[PDB]
Amino acid sequence: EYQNILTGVQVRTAPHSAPIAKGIFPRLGKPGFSYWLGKIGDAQIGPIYLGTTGVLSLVFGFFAIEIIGFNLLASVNWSPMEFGRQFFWLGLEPPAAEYGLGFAPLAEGGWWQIAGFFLTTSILLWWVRMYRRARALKMGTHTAWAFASAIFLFLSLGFIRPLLMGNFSESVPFGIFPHLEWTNSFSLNYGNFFYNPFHMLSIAFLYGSALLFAMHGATILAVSRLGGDREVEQITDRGTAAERAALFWRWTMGFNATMESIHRWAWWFAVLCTFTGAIGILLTGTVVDNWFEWGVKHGLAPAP
Amino acid sequence: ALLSFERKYRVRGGTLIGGDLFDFWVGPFYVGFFGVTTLLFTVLGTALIVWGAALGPSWTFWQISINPPDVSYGLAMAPMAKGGLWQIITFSAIGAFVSWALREVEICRKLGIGYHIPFAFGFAILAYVSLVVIRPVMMGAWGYGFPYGFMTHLDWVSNTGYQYANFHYNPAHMLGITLFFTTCLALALHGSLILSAANPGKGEVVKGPEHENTYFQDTIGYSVGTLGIHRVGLILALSAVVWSIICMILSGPIYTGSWPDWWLWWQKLPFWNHG
Amino acid sequence: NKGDITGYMDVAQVVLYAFWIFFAGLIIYLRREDRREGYPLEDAISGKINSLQGLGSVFSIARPKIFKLKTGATYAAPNFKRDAVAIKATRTAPTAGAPFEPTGNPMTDAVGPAAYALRDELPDLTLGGQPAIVPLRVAPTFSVAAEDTDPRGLPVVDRKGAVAGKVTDLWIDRASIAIRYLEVELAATPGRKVLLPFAATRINAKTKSKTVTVQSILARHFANVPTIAKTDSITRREEDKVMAYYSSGYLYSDRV
Amino acid sequence: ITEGEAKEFHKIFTSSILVFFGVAAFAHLLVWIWRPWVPGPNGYS
Amino acid sequence: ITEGEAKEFHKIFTSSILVFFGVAAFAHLLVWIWRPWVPGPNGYS
Amino acid sequence: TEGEAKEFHKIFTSSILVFFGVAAFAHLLVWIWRPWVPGPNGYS
Amino acid sequence: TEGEAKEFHKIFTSSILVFFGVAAFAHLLVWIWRPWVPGPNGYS
Amino acid sequence: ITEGEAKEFHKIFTSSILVFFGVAAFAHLLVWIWRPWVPGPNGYS
Amino acid sequence: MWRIWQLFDPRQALVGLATFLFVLALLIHFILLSTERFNWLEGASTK
Amino acid sequence: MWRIWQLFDPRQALVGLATFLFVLALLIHFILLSTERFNWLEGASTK
Amino acid sequence: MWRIWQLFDPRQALVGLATFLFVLALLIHFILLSTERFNWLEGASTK
Amino acid sequence: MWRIWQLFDPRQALVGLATFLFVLALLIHFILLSTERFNWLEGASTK
Amino acid sequence: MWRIWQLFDPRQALVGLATFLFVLALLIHFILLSTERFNWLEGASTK
Amino acid sequence: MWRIWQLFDPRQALVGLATFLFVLALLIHFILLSTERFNWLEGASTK
Amino acid sequence: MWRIWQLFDPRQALVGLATFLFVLALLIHFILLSTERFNWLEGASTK
């Protein structure tokens, strides 16, 4: 009874990759092989492409990470021991309300603003990198727009809502426990963030993404004895694996997808999980002061 | 009422129970014995939910709630008016979920495919059972299950989360959140890669597995593979559910205190316990 | 007050209803994409184009999108190329919902779990315009990685333990580096050679000796495995046929 | 599937059922003597 | 497996059953001598 | 794996007895220090 | 192998004996410093 | 893996262990002279 | 009802009835245990 | 009723018999333990 | 009474019985520990 | 007691037995540490 | 007990034994450091 | 005692020994730094 | 004590040694910075 959960016998060949124009930068990384990764998936590692947008994104991101880490280490007076003790509790806090959207003093949130700007720039440059890498390989840019949804949520959390409130004071800090505490206090300040309906939609789409990527993973693993793992080939030439995958769900559920359209569902659930989340974040504080009172007004709560 | 390829696999057999009695289809659905049983449990549970809505004061779909019995009843069966209806709906839901999974098993046997899908659904059934049976039994009362209501089960989630004064600090909860977020990210990447390979633009012949591997080799530095991605995705979702179950068993049955100050153990390891 | 639009209606509710409209449209779009294979629906008995469908039919089926291949080929989705109503089976009851009794040996008649899609007779292509599924003999560069049992020469047995045959060669996918097939020479017929999918094997590297076992079909069933033509490059239809035959074992591996 | 095997197994199944039911009945009698589980009209004295 | 290689397995199994049950009853007897687990009509002392 | 296991069983039982002997000696010492069976009054 | 096992065990027993003797010395020193078995009134 | 280089490795390995343990013991003697790490009955004074 | 077992599998029917009867009896027993009057373990007073 | 096992498979019937008996025994024992009267580990006394 | 062992798997029977009996013993011991009267570690007075 | 090992691999039998003995020894030791009376490290008084 | 070295190669046996021994010793040292009395660094008064 | 070197090649053995000893030295130094008595940098008084 | 380089290739050995030495030096400098006595940047009276 085999399951295609682990690859008992592996194959290793001469590393090769799809052809790209040389460009200013070559492929970098001297590809190698790994055993556990080949047990769970492919064994080859790299090479990683590092173009102009890749260099720009890496430099901006590294600057942001170094600024954040330097501030975290400085907050505990440069003690490696006490840095270890408080690492989770350490955080680069955003500037206070009084400074508006302008530059705060470095100790009072200027470093947070500089780090956030550099991180935003690196994330956007990484988005451009995904777009350009997809276009270079003569492929579509679905990954870029799926990423753009996540960037929308990130910018709504960090920049857009501060713009609307005219204030970075309620932005999320750069810390492990501090950003969870920001989540908790954001929910408390605005009345039981469960009563945010776009939060409910985002949770529905997150649950649906997990559900869908368990359903689809189990379906492809169930038809992997029939060439079902080779999804694009079953999309261009429908084999019996795709037919049985469709008929299983048609018989158990009443309807079914295509090998191509199931990944459209997969794309859209993931994208909507963050799109509705960004909308719900942009709506709180600006339009809806208290989500519990909005729910009471609109029939979500028994009106105490 | 059949797909272009459906009237070729509609053979009999593959049923665990019932023989040829319920081995048939109604419309698109396959029924089997376990389809009959899931109808039995679903109709009864939904009728009981609507009956509890009638006994309730709202009919507002989001304010309809079936509450479990008060904790003063312990693990005892409760009167139907006050607590018992929630218990019967719980048992009916468990029976319907099990019938659903078993019907999926019969469909898998009939189509000659693996039983991965019912096995994966077993984890969702286990999460529900841990929320309404296992955890309330360990805690000693049926009133620790969640109410069957649209917004009231969210009130239960919030109340139980703040019972430990910050439920984020539950480390198993952190790990389950990490797995859920990573599952969503991996699903986005996988659907995006498949769509981009199948729909590459004007001209732009359909790309092969080598192009899909090359994309993530260039962008990330590693590519899992068109078979291994479904593996890692199923494992990601199932592990997220497993660690959520673990974090809810840990809260109440095992740990009955503030999760935030559970982490003081970390603060006081001997190589930085400055005191 | 601050966020309202008209008395009871406010901005958040309006954005919510806008999302609901967008999600209804998105569900329609996704269902249109779903209805790109096996559509339109046929009658369960006669096979005429019929189904209980409403005013959404005009929007149910999408125009055929065109897939371009790196050979000049083209796929149309949906292509309304359907299967024949008359299959090698008979209705248990004439009620349009009843299952089918096979009218022969369903292993070799491609009925039920043995049924295979009627694909095209072309091997999968690599980035270089060559077959992807090839035996290791005609791929000198490819080799089996170490730290794994080499499945060459190991006895091929069923669940009953009878030695069905012996493995001589491995067939692998060039596009994705993994073993696809094991070439098995029959202990009963040296002049016969068969392909057994790698997904249907247990490694069995942890026992008294090393062997390859199959849990689906019995030893005698290896005498009727579908054959292939080129013996060094296999078409999609041939591989789909072989995989369907092997997958049909679990349902009726002991007669019908 | 041998019929004689089933006929032989019937004897051992009957002996097992008799000994198990006897143990259970003795246990229930001991429990009843210790504490009856059928309440009186006034509850439990 | 074998026809007669289970009678000796039955021998060792019944020997193990006696060895386990004897020490189990031995332990139970000491527990009862120490503290009985059946309360009297007015409870425990 | 039919006769060569006789020595394995014999020295297995030898290890059984010696480990149980040291464990019983440990338990005897612990009992002398502090018994683990309460009396009618408990632990006095 | 079989020949290597003789001397391998011959020096394994000596090495474990040396480790156990050092551990016994360490425990005896610690007991001299502070015994870890309390008294009827606890730790004096 | 010829054993001559094994022996040549082992001799200098033993010498290295000896010098490492010697310098470590000298360091421990210096630290003990500085501050002892075994408290007496009354603790640290 | 002469031969109704020429239509229903006796094994499947017997197993289904055993399971149904056990489940129904367990449900009725638990319902009685939920009450104040027929809980023979709590043993409340009729008067 | 010596013809029940003529078609009933013996091994599955006995495995399920033992499992069902054990589960029911656990349930009844725990129910008794939950009672204020038959809990033999505390003995809350009748009168 | 000997054909039972040629009916069942001798290795599976031993493994399952050993683990099941161990789990049962562990549960009984932990229940006794949770009991005020029979906890042999806290040692509260019988009176 | 002569022919047990023909069914169980002695290597894995020893590995599993040693793992079980170590785990159970740790469980008993930590349980005693959690007790007041048998904690030999954070020691308490018998009386 | 010399024959034990045919079941287990000394290669894996010694690395496993060494890592287990070091982990056990380190955990015991942590336990002693943490309790109250055998912590040789804080060195509190015994009485 | 030299026989170690035909199972453990000196490359891996010495790199592992170096990593282990360096980690242990860091551990002991940090543990000392956490104690007041032996923190040679803060230099709290003995009394 | 020169025969080391037959095993350890100078290329990766030097890179690892340099990285380790830099990390150790940085760690010590940070530890010194934290301490109120040896912080040469903030500056504090010894007396």
Ligand code: 07D
């Ligand atoms: C007490 C807390 C309170 C409580 C009531 C509660 C409970 C629950 N909630 Mg919630 N939540 C509360 C508050 C609250 N909640 C959210 C969000 C969500 C979404 C996130 C989706 C996601 O993927 O995020 C995650 C995606 C992001 C943040 C966007 C993409 C991120 C990117 C590209 C970052 C790129 C990073 C690098 C390149 C690395 C280098 C950078 C550095 C080192 C710095 C999701 C659906 C979700 C789930 C649930 C569940 C299941 C529950 C249960 C069971 O109770 N919650 C966010 C949101 O969208 O809200 C509308 C948000 O902002 C916010 C707030 C304030």
Ligand SMILES: CCc1c(C)c2cc3nc(cc4[nH]c(c(CCC(=O)OC/C=C(\C)CC/C=C(\C)CC/C=C(\C)CCC=C(C)C)c4C)c4c5nc(cc1[nH]2)C(C)=C5C(=O)[C@@H]4C(=O)OC)C(C)=C3C(C)=O
């Ligand atoms: C559908 C909604 C879905 C949700 C649930 C979801 C959530 C979260 N997604 C998260 C993180 C990331 N997401 C990503 C990438 C961006 C990388 C970046 O910005 O680099 C740009 C930054 C930086 C350069 C800064 C640091 C750099 C470091 C640490 C290295 C520093 C050292 C250097 C340079 C020197 C050494 C090395 C040399 C070579 C010299 C990261 C890993 C991406 C995508 N999400 C998508 C979608 C989703 N993301 C899609 C479709 C994606 C992409 O296409 C893209 C990608 O590359 O995916 C592989 C997080 C933390 C999430 C949570 C839960 O909070």
Ligand SMILES: COC(C)(C)C\C=C/C(C)=C/C=C/C(C)=C/C=C/C(C)=C/C=C\C=C(C)\C=C\C=C(C)\C=C\C=C(C)\C=C\CC(C)(C)OC
């Ligand atoms: C490589 O690193 C070595 C040295 C080892 C270590 C270095 C660093 C370390 C250890 C870093 C650790 C970092 C940690 C723990 C980070 C935790 C980060 C988390 C959890 C962040 C989570 C959320 C934060 C978000 C979403 C913040 C978003 C902020 C945004 C988008 C702000 C944008 C602000 C802008 C654009 C400001 C505009 C205003 C002005 C005018 C200033 O712009 C010019």
Ligand SMILES: CCCCCCCCCCCCO[C@@H]1O[C@H](CO)[C@@H](O[C@H]2O[C@H](CO)[C@@H](O)[C@H](O)[C@H]2O)[C@H](O)[C@H]1O
């Ligand atoms: C100003 C505030 C801070 C924000 C940062 C602004 C500068 C960084 C973003 C500038 C815009 C980048 O936009 C992008 O630039 C790079 C060159 O840099 C170009 O891309 C170039 O590098 C890519 C890397 O894959 C190569 O294929 C090739 O050398 C060339 O195409 C893209 O054609 C352009 O789309």
Ligand SMILES: CCCCCCCCCCCCO[C@@H]1O[C@H](CO)[C@@H](O[C@H]2O[C@H](CO)[C@@H](O)[C@H](O)[C@H]2O)[C@H](O)[C@H]1O
């Ligand atoms: C595979 C095995 C599956 C079964 C495993 C079961 C494990 C746990 C079983 C617990 C059974 C509890 O059973 C139920 O307990 C509650 C506890 O309040 C009892 O409740 C009753 O007694 C308690 C006192 O003990 C009272 O406070 C309560 O008001 C009263 O209703 C019920 O009379 C009993 O029916």
Ligand SMILES: CCCCCCCCCCCCO[C@@H]1O[C@H](CO)[C@@H](O[C@H]2O[C@H](CO)[C@@H](O)[C@H](O)[C@H]2O)[C@H](O)[C@H]1O
């Ligand atoms: C495995 C087989 C299991 C078989 C189990 C059989 C259970 C049924 C036993 C029925 C015995 C009835 O016995 C009858 O019950 C009544 C209650 O109505 C009891 O009534 C008597 O005892 C109760 C004790 O609470 C007193 O309060 C009451 O005043 C007194 O009359 C008596 O004991 C007896 O007259």
Ligand SMILES: CCCCCCCCCCCCO[C@@H]1O[C@H](CO)[C@@H](O[C@H]2O[C@H](CO)[C@@H](O)[C@H](O)[C@H]2O)[C@H](O)[C@H]1O
């Ligand atoms: C290996 C499996 C172990 C099997 C264990 C079997 C346990 C069975 C033990 C119970 C047997 C009956 O034992 C009987 O119970 C009654 C119940 O009032 C008790 O009756 C006596 O003791 C109680 C309680 O101390 C006192 O109030 C009084 O002295 C007297 O009534 C006695 O203990 C005994 O006469």
Ligand SMILES: [Fe+3]
């Ligand atoms: Fe997929």
